[PDB]
Amino acid sequence: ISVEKSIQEQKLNGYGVGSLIKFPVSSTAPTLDAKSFYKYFQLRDTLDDRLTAVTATEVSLEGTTLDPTDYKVDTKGQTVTVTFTAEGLKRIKAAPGKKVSAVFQGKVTEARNGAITNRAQVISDTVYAEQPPTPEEPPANPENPPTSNEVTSRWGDLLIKKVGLQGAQFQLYKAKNAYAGTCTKDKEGDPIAINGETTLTTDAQGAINVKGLFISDSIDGANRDNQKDATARCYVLVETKAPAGYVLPAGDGAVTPVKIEVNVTIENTKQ
Ligand SMILES: [Zn+2]
């Protein structure tokens, strides 16, 4: 019995703080003897404290379509469980070699040290019986259960200062050369939502504090908008509105390349 963990392309969920990180978790169902049955089967994941409103979605058994009464998803503190019901356990027994999976998830509140890690576990047990038994509640604290590989999603912060001048407005973009040694003005895509807001406004001190932007993750693979071993990522900052009475520079003048690592001062000239 083994558990595998990955991470969804962060692009699909959003580069900024307040976005979800989604973790696909899967375990290949064992081949049970005819008279061996599950007492229980649970996917468990205690998510990193930087992730809030933690839960699981997309519960699946490969090659099958589950119904809503096949499992129960619950959160206790940071710990999410996907616990298969009696019907679900019968399905899993009938599906040897097939992947049992779910996507664990939480909302990014902030970067902190910048390395958000995750593991998941499979809590299951079987018993020989002449007659198929009713399931049992999985134990709260099993000793050393099968545990996945650890994955890591890396995040950094950004502090912008307009000079402080209140009411200046900015928008953040994905950079074309996201992993350049020297970041460039070249951008693509729509503005990035920071806690649901795509327009950033400097406060009384002329500051915008972006508490998290995605840098890279530990997953390898073609065309993932990623660089596995990267500790810094490029973004493009665009000034959209000058503070009251100030010049908003034309074209490339209002575009700033920013290097986010696991701080930026824009200088203003008055009319
Ligand atoms: Zn069912």
| Resolution stated for this PDB structure, in Å | 1.9
Dihedral angle at the C-alpha atoms of 218, 219, 221, 222, nearest 10 degrees? -70
According to the entry, how was the structure determined?
X-ray
Neighbouring CB atoms inside 10 A of 85's CB total: 17
79 CB contacts (<8 Å, ≥6 apart)? 44, 45, 46, 47
267: three-class secondary structure by DSSP: coil
- What is the whole-number distance in angstroms between the Cα of residue 247 and the centre of ligand 1? 64
Residue 87 in marked binding region: yes
Our measurement of the distance from residue 69's CA atom to the centroid of its chain's CA atoms, rounded to an integer in Å, reads 27
Domains of the chain: 1-156 (2.60.40.740), 157-271 (2.60.40.10)
DSSP string, 119-181: --EEEEEEEE-SSPPPP-PPPSS-SS--BPPPEEEEEEEEEEEE---TT-EEEEEEESSTT-S
Count of CB atoms situated within 10 Å of the CB of 141: 6
CA distance 248 to 210: 22
| Distance (Å) from CA 63 to ligand 1 centroid | 14
User: In residues, how long is the chain?
Assistant: 271
Check residue 190 and report its DSSP letter. S
The helix, strand and coil proportions of the chain, stated in percent and rounded to the nearest 5, come to: 5, 45, 45
CA-based nearest residue to 235, from 251, 219, 255: 255
Which among 122, 148, 123 has a CA at the least distance from the CA of 6? 148
Cα 236 to Cα 12, 61, 174, 177, 202, distances in angstroms: 19, 41, 6, 10, 17
Expressed in angstroms and rounded, the spacing between residue 39 Cα and the centre of ligand 1 is 17
Cα 242 to chain centroid distance, Å, stands at 34
**Residue 186 marked ligand-binding:** no
Whether the CB-CB separation of 170 and 248 falls below 8 Å is answered with no
> What residue type is assigned to position 184 of the chain?
T
